[PDB]
Design a protein around this ligand. Structure first.
Ligand SMILES: [Mg+2]
Ligand SMILES: [Mg+2]
Ligand SMILES: [Mg+2]
Ligand SMILES: [Mg+2]
Ligand SMILES: [Mg+2]
Ligand SMILES: [Mg+2]
Ligand SMILES: [Mg+2]
Ligand SMILES: [Mg+2]
Ligand SMILES: [Mg+2]
Ligand SMILES: [Mg+2]
Ligand SMILES: [Mg+2]
Ligand SMILES: [Mg+2]
Ligand SMILES: [Mg+2]
Ligand SMILES: [Mg+2]
Ligand SMILES: [Mg+2]
Ligand SMILES: [Mg+2]
Ligand SMILES: [Mg+2]
Ligand SMILES: [Mg+2]
Ligand SMILES: [Mg+2]
Ligand SMILES: [Mg+2]
Ligand SMILES: [Mg+2]
Ligand SMILES: [Mg+2]
Ligand SMILES: [Mg+2]
Ligand SMILES: [Mg+2]
Ligand SMILES: [Mg+2]
Ligand SMILES: [Mg+2]
Ligand SMILES: [Mg+2]
Ligand SMILES: [Mg+2]
Ligand SMILES: [Mg+2]
Ligand SMILES: [Mg+2]
Ligand SMILES: [Mg+2]
Ligand SMILES: [Mg+2]
Ligand SMILES: [Mg+2]
Ligand SMILES: [Mg+2]
Ligand SMILES: [Zn+2]
Lengths: 126, 37, 176, 23, 133, 136, 192
RNA sequence: ACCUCGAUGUCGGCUCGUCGCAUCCUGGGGCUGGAGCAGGUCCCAAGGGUUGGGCUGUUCGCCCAUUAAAGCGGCACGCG
RNA sequence: GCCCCUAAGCGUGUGCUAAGUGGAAAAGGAUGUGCAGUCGCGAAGACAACCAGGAGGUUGGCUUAGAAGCAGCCACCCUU
């Protein structure tokens, strides 16, 4: 994959992030492609689920004030953007993690702030 | 233990090495073991 | 090279003495002595480690670097903890039992076979089919384990013989 | 053929300058 | 944890399934009778069946939709597929049958929309060397 | 077996090995080619074996050009014959090959199999040879 | 379509001959002769490596600016001598060209695309000759083959050209021929 | 057609040997389409051993009993 | 030609060779090593190592007892 492709991916991630009300960063280690397809079925109607390189998002995170999310990029990175509403993907990821048990919620980003596991669980209840 | 002037890595598992000045091919499959003699 | 520039930590109870090229390490399991090659220089990193250095970047020094480093690492981890490798025996009527220090095997021969215990190593049988070999020196433990392993020729058909812990042997079938 | 080979090979000495009688 | 393709109204063939199901710890008679009942309810096409096994020798059979190969063959009117696809064309298929099979595969596949399944069926016919119109 | 239909003289001197090739030194018909590096007589049966090797490795597609034709004959006397009593009968046909000559040309879609087939061909020839392409 | 001249240094040959030529080639230099409409031939020597890099970058017909003792000259690579074995460059013939001049140049033709899978594509012409402005010669000419069915002939008339370039050779020149793919048995009678 | 025609005696057999290893047996191995017994192929190995008869002048060969085996060659096709 | 036999250099400077190559040989085989030159990727973290995934259509069709990504032949696609 070329460095120009890396720049294009950075630009695409930034463009997707600019149109997203919130985002969720999670861990996906230990999940088959069938599970990911089911998650895309659950999310693809309204939200968006992606997985991207840590440093490519890090450079793509320098656009806005999400630069504080870099500490959430140590380990596997799974991004969930909410194109429709803000928290449907939050319940979708939480139920997927509870059912599969192989998903770890690294954190979330909402209202210009990065929030931890308990905070995101509280937010999803809202 | 093939002994040939020509030795080659028959399968992808075969490794080509040198032992004591002799070119050898070592592999998990015992058939593929061969030396240059 | 890549292995060579990694200094070797020293546990607390380990005494390290450097005499020119010679090195000696004393620890709970005993004492061991090593000698490094001339182009490789050994030093005591005051933060509690060993440093090996090659002045040159040529082939011979670059090859001896990682060798010496790994030798020192094995040297210290032998006396701090030790080495112990486990064996199983497969087949009907194949058995092991210890006669004091010596190890006694029934391997389907007309006669039972015996193995002495060389200096600095012990055998500990757990079950008539599972036993272990323990020592402070990795090389000697490996040597005796290989000798034990070679006791009966490979058997691709029924799999009878002495095997290592997790060894997965290749097997074929004798149809007739 | 060793004898003929050896003669025709000592042809190649420094002093003989690459030629000898009877090749 | 296996998957086979078997005729709808037929049970216990010796080559395809018998020894295949014998060494997987699956009871064959109950599977055959239940599958025969289900595929006589279906009665239309040969079916692929996926077998999932448990530790108590319990077997669960999943019956998918009729294969795209067989569905396209029966919709096009031909019996066997083209031996040289994209060189010899043996049949013609209109978009209505394509969309019916697309709905069936939407019931089967992960495609988000009917058009994706229709494209999948068109590719399947391309592997069959059958024109899609 | 390539044999000329007729030759004006049926008994000829040996083709001379001196010098290097002047004509036919570059690939002209196909994508890939075999260039010689040694001086040699190449017989018609060596050409046949090499051509068959290329055909078997390539199977269906592609096309093979042979830029060399064995029109020079060589003679031998009958066995167990003393020296003298005229020149012998000609019984094998050869082509004079100089370094730089392009012997075979191949046109096939993919790189790997084309190289492999040509290599199979070189392994059938009495000369050192290399593989060349259209590009400079 | 504008090309920038490539800058190379040249040294007037003190002595000409075969001994001088071999010595210069041994010294990593390539001999050349610069001549043109000005009726004034000059014998030069160039750096082989720079010259080869220029040819790799901009093909065998590259416009050059040469520094002959502080004098800038525009030239075109009219001819090359490549050793058949070593594949060096033994000698170069450079043609004096001024801006806004029409010259005849052989431009290579390359093909790309994917024809019908049951077909084989053969190229009969490596290059075609074209009238073009000195600074506006094309690096290469392309012909696209796709969906081409059975026996189809591409001729020099059908090839596409840039603006301002005129094709001189007769359009009847068969450049690319697409033929039915030979069958497995079809390979056994050719050459037998 | 280089020594030998003012002479270098030629095939088998006998007696006596001596060397090589491209190994017939005995010895040590690897791979097998090596279950075992028995094989196939390759590698290392020259210490010792390697039968008696019928027919054919016989080189050669066929055959009868055996044997662990009944090796292949050089030495003026060793040796008048 | 110049270490000793054997007259004269175990001459000087810079590199190479590990094969006693030097002090015999081919097609061909090969992670031996030195030098020089291109192209690819790489701190936007490269290669190796350790961890998780590698799915659905579908067993793509013809062919066969058999063809399921893995006798063979043709096409050689789509969704997440
Ligand atoms: Mg071979
Ligand atoms: Mg000979
Ligand atoms: Mg001569
Ligand atoms: Mg002449
Ligand atoms: Mg000519
Ligand atoms: Mg020519
Ligand atoms: Mg050859
Ligand atoms: Mg005479
Ligand atoms: Mg006489
Ligand atoms: Mg006399
Ligand atoms: Mg006399
Ligand atoms: Mg004798
Ligand atoms: Mg031997
Ligand atoms: Mg033996
Ligand atoms: Mg053996
Ligand atoms: Mg012996
Ligand atoms: Mg002895
Ligand atoms: Mg003898
Ligand atoms: Mg004799
Ligand atoms: Mg005699
Ligand atoms: Mg006598
Ligand atoms: Mg006699
Ligand atoms: Mg003397
Ligand atoms: Mg002296
Ligand atoms: Mg000197
Ligand atoms: Mg000295
Ligand atoms: Mg000296
Ligand atoms: Mg020196
Ligand atoms: Mg020597
Ligand atoms: Mg040699
Ligand atoms: Mg080679
Ligand atoms: Mg080299
Ligand atoms: Mg698939
Ligand atoms: Mg099949
Ligand atoms: Zn192998």
């Amino acid at each position: 994959m070329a460095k120009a492709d890396k720049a294009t991916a950075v630009a695409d991630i930034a463009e997707q992030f600019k149109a997203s009300t919130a985002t969720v960063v999670t861990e996906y280690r230990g999940l088959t492609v069938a599970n990911l397809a089911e998650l895309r079925r659950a999310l693809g109607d309204s939200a968006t689920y992606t997985v991207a390189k840590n440093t490519l998002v890090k450079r793509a995170a320098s656009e806005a004030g999400i630069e504080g999310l870099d500490e959430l990029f140590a380990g596997p990175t799974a991004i969930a953007f909410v194109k429709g509403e803000a928290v449907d993907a939050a319940k979708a990821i939480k139920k997927f993690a509870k059912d599969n048990k192989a998903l770890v919620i690294k954190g979330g980003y909402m209202d210009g702030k990065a929030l931890s596991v308990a905070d995101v669980e509280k937010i999803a209840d809202l | 233990m093939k002994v040939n002037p020509s030795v080659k890595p028959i399968c992808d598992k075969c490794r080509v090495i040198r032992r004591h000045g002799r070119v050898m091919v070592i592999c998990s499959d015992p058939r593929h073991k061969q030396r240059q003699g | 090279s890549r292995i060579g520039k990694q200094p070797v930590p020293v546990p607390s109870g380990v005494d390290v003495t450097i005499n020119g090229q010679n090195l000696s390490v004393k620890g709970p399991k005993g004492t061991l002595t090593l000698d490094v090659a001339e182009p490789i220089s050994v030093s005591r990193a005051e933060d509690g480690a060993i440093v090996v250095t090659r002045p040159d970047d040529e082939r011979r020094s670059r090859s001896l670097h990682g060798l010496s480093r790994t030798l020192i690492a094995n040297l210290v981890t032998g006396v701090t903890e030790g080495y112990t490798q486990k064996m199983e025996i497969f087949g009907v009527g194949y058995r092991v039992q210890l006669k004091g220090q010596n190890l006694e095997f029934a391997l389907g021969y007309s006669h039972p076979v015996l193995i002495e215990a060389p200096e600095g190593i012990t055998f500990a049988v757990e079950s008539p089919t599972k036993f272990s070999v323990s020592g402070i020196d990795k090389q000697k433990v490996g040597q005796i384990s290989a000798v034990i392993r070679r006791l009966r020729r490979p058997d691709p058909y029924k799999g009878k013989g002495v095997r290592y812990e997790g060894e997965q042997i290749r097997r074929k079938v004798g149809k007739t | 053929a060793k004898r003929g080979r050896k003669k025709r090979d000592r042809k190649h000495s420094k002093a003989n300058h690459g030629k000898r009688p009877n090749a | 944890l296996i998957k086979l393709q078997i005729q709808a109204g037929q049970a216990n063939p010796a080559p395809p399934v018998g020894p295949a199901l014998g060494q997987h710890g699956v009871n064959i008679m109950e599977f055959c009778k239940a599958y025969n009942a289900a595929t006589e309810s279906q009665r239309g096409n040969v079916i692929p069946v996926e077998i999932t096994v448990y530790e108590d020798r319990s077997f669960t059979f999943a019956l998918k939709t009729p294969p795209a190969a067989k569905l396209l063959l029966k919709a096009a009117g031909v019996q066997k597929g083209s031996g040289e696809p994209h060189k010899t064309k043996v049949a013609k298929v209109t978009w209505d049958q394509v969309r019916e099979i697309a709905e069936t595969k939407k019931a089967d596949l992960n495609a988000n929309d009917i058009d994706a399944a229709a494209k999948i069926i068109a590719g399947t016919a391309r592997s069959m060397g059958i024109t899609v119109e | 077996m390539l044999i000329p239909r007729k030759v004006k003289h049926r008994k000829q001197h040996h083709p001379e090995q001196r010098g290097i090739a002047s004509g036919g030194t570059s690939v002209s018909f196909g994508d890939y080619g075999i260039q010689a590096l040694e001086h040699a007589y190449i017989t018609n049966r060596q050409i046949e074996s090499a051509r068959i090797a290329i055909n078997r490795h390539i199977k269906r597609g592609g096309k093979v050009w042979i830029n060399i034709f064995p029109d020079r004959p060589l003679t031998k006397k009958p066995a167990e014959t003393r020296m003298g009593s005229g020149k012998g009968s000609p019984e094998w046909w050869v082509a004079n090959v100089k370094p730089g000559r392009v012997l075979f040309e191949l046109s096939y879609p993919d790189e790997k199999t084309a190289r492999d087939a040509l290599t199979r061909a070189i392994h059938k020839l009495p000369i050192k040879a290399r593989i060349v392409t259209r590009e400079e | 379509t504008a090309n920038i001249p490539n800058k190379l240094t040249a040294n007037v040959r003190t002595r000409t001959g075969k001994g001088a030529s071999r010595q210069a080639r041994r010294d990593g230099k390539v001999p050349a002769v610069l001549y043109g409409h000005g009726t004034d031939p000059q014998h030069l020597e160039l750096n082989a490596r720079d010259f080869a890099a220029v040819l790799r970058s901009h093909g065998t017909n590259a416009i050059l600016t040469l520094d002959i003792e502080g004098t800038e000259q525009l030239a075109l690579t009219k001819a090359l001598d490549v050793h058949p074995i070593r594949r060096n460059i033994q000698h170069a013939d450079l043609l004096v060209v001024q801006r806004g001049e029409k010259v005849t140049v052989e431009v290579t033709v390359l093909v790309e695309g994917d024809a019908t899978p049951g077909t084989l594509v053969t190229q009969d012409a490596n290059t075609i000759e074209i009238e073009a402005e000195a600074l506006s010669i094309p690096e290469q000419l392309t012909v696209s083959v796709e969906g081409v069915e059975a026996g189809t002939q591409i001729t020099a008339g059908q090839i596409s050209l840039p603006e301002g370039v005129n094709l001189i050779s007769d359009p009847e020149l068969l450049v690319v021929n697409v033929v039915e793919a030979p069958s497995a048995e079809a390979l056994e009678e050719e050459g037998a």
